[PDB]
Design a protein around this ligand. Structure first.
Ligand SMILES: O=C(O)CNC(=O)C(=O)O
Ligand SMILES: [Mg+2]
Ligand code: NI
Ligand SMILES: [Zn+2]
Length: 331
């Protein structure tokens, strides 16, 4: 078995290997990359996502989210308070202000320590989940707005045509902005490209061990667990590396820098934080190996999770028994 310890693998494709996205995902899996839940892909030196980032300041962040925490430093939830719209230029200035800027630090490890010690005492503002793309239309390789769609994959594997579309999202971050522990909707893959700015630290649990994280989470968030049989779908719970280590949960960590791709694999729980002002683009995707995970994916039916138009059809075709109850949640 390849990569039996489930370590995060880092790939350096050549320009010739970068032409065929599907084939390269399959190659990474042949080397065991999926066992970690997360892989890093450093593009060839010939490649570029676009020519410059000099003209992005007028993009609107219609609903910036202030991420307010409750709990203790290592075990907390966050809720998203909606703020007034602002441009990317206004958001960058805010991120760089004395109130929100990254503190002085020695290295990524010192910054990580400061994040876990102090995150709960601040409420950074995240420009998340903004439909759009920063890839130039002439970038032919690994262009996240030009991937094969998940609806087409389902049709190719299973023979059934379904409604729905699949488009990317932009994320503008600042110091301490946080992504809570989650897997993707319907346990899909994701791919994330860090266009510019400061790094993003990721934590991940191997897919084969995901239920261990779920059992810990039920213990640590006991009211939430009673409310919903899949409450990590709400994307609000944080658990620190120290707490995971104390409870024997297998995980790994890695820092993504500007110019790098990260891929999350089906049922790979992940969480993390931004080091300072940055912009990332991400989208979900599928492969033939995903279909069996999609059929088995948990779902939030308490109603909190409220998820894209296109998820309907995946539940309807892959999970017909659940269908009914799940759509009662979403209406
Ligand atoms: O970058 C973020 O805030 C969150 N991204 C992801 O969870 C992803 O790409 O799967
Ligand atoms: Mg602009
Ligand atoms: Ni994700
Ligand atoms: Zn729920």
């Amino acid at each position: 078995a390849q990569n039996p310890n489930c370590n995060i693998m880092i790939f350096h494709p050549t320009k010739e290997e970068f032409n065929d996205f599907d084939k390269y995902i399959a190659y990474m899996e042949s080397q065991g990359a999926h066992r970690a839940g997360l892989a890093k892909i450093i593009p060839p030196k010939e490649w570029k996502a676009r020519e410059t980032y000099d003209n992005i300041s007028e993009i609107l962040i219609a609903t910036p989210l202030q991420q307010v925490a409750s709990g203790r430093a290592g075990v907390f939830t966050q809720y998203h308070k909606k703020k007034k719209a602002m441009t990317v230029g206004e958001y960058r200035h805010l991120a760089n202000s004395k109130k929100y800027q990254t503190p002085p630090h020695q290295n990524f490890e010192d910054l990580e320590r400061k994040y876990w010690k102090n995150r709960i005492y601040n409420s950074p503002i995240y420009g998340a989940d903004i439909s759009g793309s920063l890839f130039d239309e002439n970038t032919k390789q690994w262009n996240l707005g030009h991937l094969g769609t998940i609806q087409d994959l389902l049709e190719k594997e299973c023979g059934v045509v379904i409604e729905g579309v699949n488009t990317p999202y932009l994320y503008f971050g600042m110091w301490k902005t946080t992504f809570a522990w989650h897997t993707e909707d319907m346990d899909l893959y994701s791919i994330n490209y860090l266009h510019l700015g400061e790094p993003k630290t990721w934590y991940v649990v191997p897919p084969e061990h995901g239920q261990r994280l779920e059992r810990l989470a039920r213990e640590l968030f006991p009211g939430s667990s009673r409310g919903c049989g899949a409450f990590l779908r709400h994307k609000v719970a944080l658990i620190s590396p120290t707490v995971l280590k104390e409870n024997g949960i297998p995980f790994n960590r890695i820092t993504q820098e500007a110019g790098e791709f990260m891929v999350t694999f089906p049922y790979g729980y992940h969480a993390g934080f931004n080091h300072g002002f940055n912009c990332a683009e991400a989208i979900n995707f599928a492969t033939p190996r995903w279909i069996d995970y999609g059929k088995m994916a948990s779902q939030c039916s308490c109603g909190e999770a409220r998820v894209t138009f296109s998820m309907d059809a995946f539940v309807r075709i892959l999970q017909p028994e659940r269908y009914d109850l799940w759509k009662r949640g979403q209406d």
